[PDB]
């Protein structure tokens, strides 16, 4: 049985995979991590005890029958009541996370991907360094809490500019309503005069590389799905003084494909969402690999890639 | 240069390791994780440019000169002012953590221990499973949010009882700012009638094994320092079978340091409890049995292997 580690509000990727798994003659159990412990019962035995078992209403999954694990979405304990004490709620979340992580890490069979591999590939500074050691171009990157280094960094890349971004995912719910998020943003001359807040939280700054194309590369095992989109606000080839777009298939150079495969092999991954950009002079710059990045918007929308089939195959075929 | 990843309020283990490193003709930089970003400056470069530098007052460290890393204490940014907005503070703590973790993971040289190894050995359920696969006795354990499975677990071990414990480390601060902590605690029959709170947080229950001694085992490389106390620590000689099994457990997780807890029954049965990759050791060095552990850590940090 394929154990699918997700949450209740996950998107259409889950039913796409379970049906492709079910259509191959195998079965799959959906484990919504956010509905634990409030609704889902998990029993984890260590020793010569009874078998570990996950119970979700009528559904029941014995952990000895797990042949594969899809390490998809991890939202441990989100459905804990809001009216709970904040000290007990934060402590309960950390206990739930350690519990379910220990369950997954103890299960045998095929993992997509193992926790130790996803954890090790989540260091974005290590991603760029390993990609560069493999011969891939990476943008100039500085994570810093030091204004003098940041000023020096923005100055040497003044012609094209620099952006900033956070290494973490989070949101600030301010005032009375909305959620606020730090997207990758250009830093301005005015932002450079207000660098005093770096002593309370560092940021990651990157060389802003002008790009002709954005590449979205999804790898399943050794199968490479490459999609490109023209993001040029001013496209030179089409420019006309007298006078939409969508994602389309793209053929990577076999050298880039073999380098991305070595990147997957180094971290031990069999799934990965890789971001690259292509300059007008056809230089390929590696940006980021997300071991749990999305893929559904490349399958349900152009170029309608059949990734969910490839994932279900490697899950039920192991290797 | 040995990078030492600790924090400002960490105990007297750091200076002794430092002096032992310095007395061996090498250099050592102390990096207090809690004093970043408010005081310590870190600059992590990726790309064709540099690697990075850590600046702390007059002291600076070029990450190119890092020959080894002691992954000791990780209190990322706990010296943030408490007058800060709580939403911004927790977001800053999460950003500071990912920044320094990526710094450590990217560094080459000898790590004691690597992050990926420590994160993998942190699964206590995996510790008991691998210890059992190597031939070590482990107490019957149940992690659960299910009262029915817990009641059966307590009836199963009704003769000796069961204890409960939390997998996580935390502390609840009451109204008087007093510090509350969940130690390993017995489970009474009154507790078994109030299991409804398991739907809000699971717990880890274990067979209460009656014991004669409690063993504190500290391993540096392949050197084993065993202490025993009656439940004033004393030396203790493990059977070689137990020592080799613990060495195989460390080699599986890829650790060269570990704090291992065991108990011995009156009939001399050795039960494996836990391995903490960053567990303390100083109290076994400054107090009986005065194990020279800080010397063994400094020697493995300088001599690589």
């Amino acid at each position: 049985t394929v154990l699918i580690v997700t949450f209740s509000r996950d998107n259409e990727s889950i039913p796409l995979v379970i049906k492709a798994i079910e259509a191959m003659g195998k079965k799959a159990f959906r484990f919504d991590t956010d509905r634990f412990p409030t609704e889902v019962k998990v029993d984890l035995y260590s020793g010569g005890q009874k078998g570990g078992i996950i119970t979700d209403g009528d559904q029941k999954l014995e952990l000895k029958e797990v042949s594969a694990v899809w390490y998809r979405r991890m939202r441990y304990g989100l459905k804990l009541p809001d009216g709970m004490d904040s000290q007990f709620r934060e402590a309960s979340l950390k206990e739930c996370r350690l519990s379910i992580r220990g369950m997954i890490a103890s299960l045998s069979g095929f993992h997509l991907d193992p926790i130790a591999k996803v954890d090790h590939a989540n260091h974005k500074q290590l991603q760029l360094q390993v990609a560069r050691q493999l011969g891939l171009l990476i943008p100039g990157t500085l994570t810093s809490n030091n204004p003098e280094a940041v000023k020096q960094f923005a100055q040497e890349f003044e012609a094209t500019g620099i952006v900033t971004k956070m290494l973490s995912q989070f949101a600030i719910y301010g005032d009375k309503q909305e959620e606020m998020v730090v997207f990758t943003s250009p830093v301005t001359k005015e932002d450079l005069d207000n660098l005093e807040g770096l002593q309370f939280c560092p940021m990651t700054f990157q060389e802003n590389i002008p790009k002709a194309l954005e590449l979205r590369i999804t790898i399943v095992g050794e199968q490479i799905f490459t999609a490109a989109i023209n993001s040029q606000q001013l496209d030179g080839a089409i420019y006309d003084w007298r006078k939409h777009q969508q994602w389309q298939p793209y053929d990577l150079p076999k050298t880039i494909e073999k380098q991305l495969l070595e990147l997957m092999k180094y971290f031990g991954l069999n799934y990965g969402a890789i971001d690259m950009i292509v300059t007008p002079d056809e230089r390929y710059i590696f940006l980021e690999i997300n071991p749990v990045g999305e893929f559904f918007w490349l399958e349900l929308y152009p170029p309608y890639f059949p990734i969910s089939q490839a994932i279900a195959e490697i899950l039920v075929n192991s290797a | 240069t040995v990078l030492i990843v600790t924090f400002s309020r960490d105990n007297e283990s750091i200076p002794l390791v430092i002096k032992a490193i310095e007395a061996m003709g090498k250099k050592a930089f102390r990096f207090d994780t809690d004093r970043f970003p408010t005081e310590v400056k870190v600059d992590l470069y990726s790309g064709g440019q540099k690697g990075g530098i850590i600046t702390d007052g007059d002291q600076k460290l070029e990450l190119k000169e890092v020959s080894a890393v002691w992954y000791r204490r990780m209190r990322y940014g706990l010296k943030l002012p408490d007058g800060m907005d709580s939403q911004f503070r927790e977001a800053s703590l999460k950003e500071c953590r990912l920044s320094i973790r990526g710094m450590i993971a990217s560094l080459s040289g000898f790590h004691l221990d690597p992050i990926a190894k420590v994160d993998h050995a942190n699964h206590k359920q995996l510790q008991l499973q691998v210890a059992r696969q190597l031939g070590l006795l482990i107490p019957g354990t149940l992690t659960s949010n299910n009262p029915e499975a817990v009641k059966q677990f307590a009836q199963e071990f009704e003769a000796t009882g069961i204890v409960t414990k939390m997998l996580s480390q935390f502390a609840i601060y009451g109204d008087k700012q007093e510090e509350m902590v969940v130690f390993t605690s017995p489970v009474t029959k009154e507790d078994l009638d109030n299991l409804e709170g398991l739907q809000f947080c699971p717990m880890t229950f274990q067979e209460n094994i009656p014991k004669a001694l409690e063993l504190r085992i500290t391993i540096v490389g392949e050197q084993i320092f065993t202490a025993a106390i009656n439940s004033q620590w004393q030396p203790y000689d493990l059977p070689k079978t137990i020592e080799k099994q613990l060495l195989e457990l460390m080699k599986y997780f890829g650790l060269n340091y570990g704090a291992i807890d065991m108990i011995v029954t009156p009939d001399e049965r050795y039960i494996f409890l836990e391995i903490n990759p960053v567990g303390e050791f100083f109290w076994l060095e400054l107090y009986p049995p005065y194990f020279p552990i800080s010397q063994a850590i400094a020697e493995i940090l300088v001599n690589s292997a």
Binding site: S92 | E179, M180, S185, L195, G197, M203
Partner: peptide, 12 residues
């Protein structure tokens, strides 16, 4: 709305 581990909180 209390979790089960609240019953075992001691004083450090």
């Amino acid at each position: 709305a209390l979790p089960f581990f609240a019953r075992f909180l001691s004083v450090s």
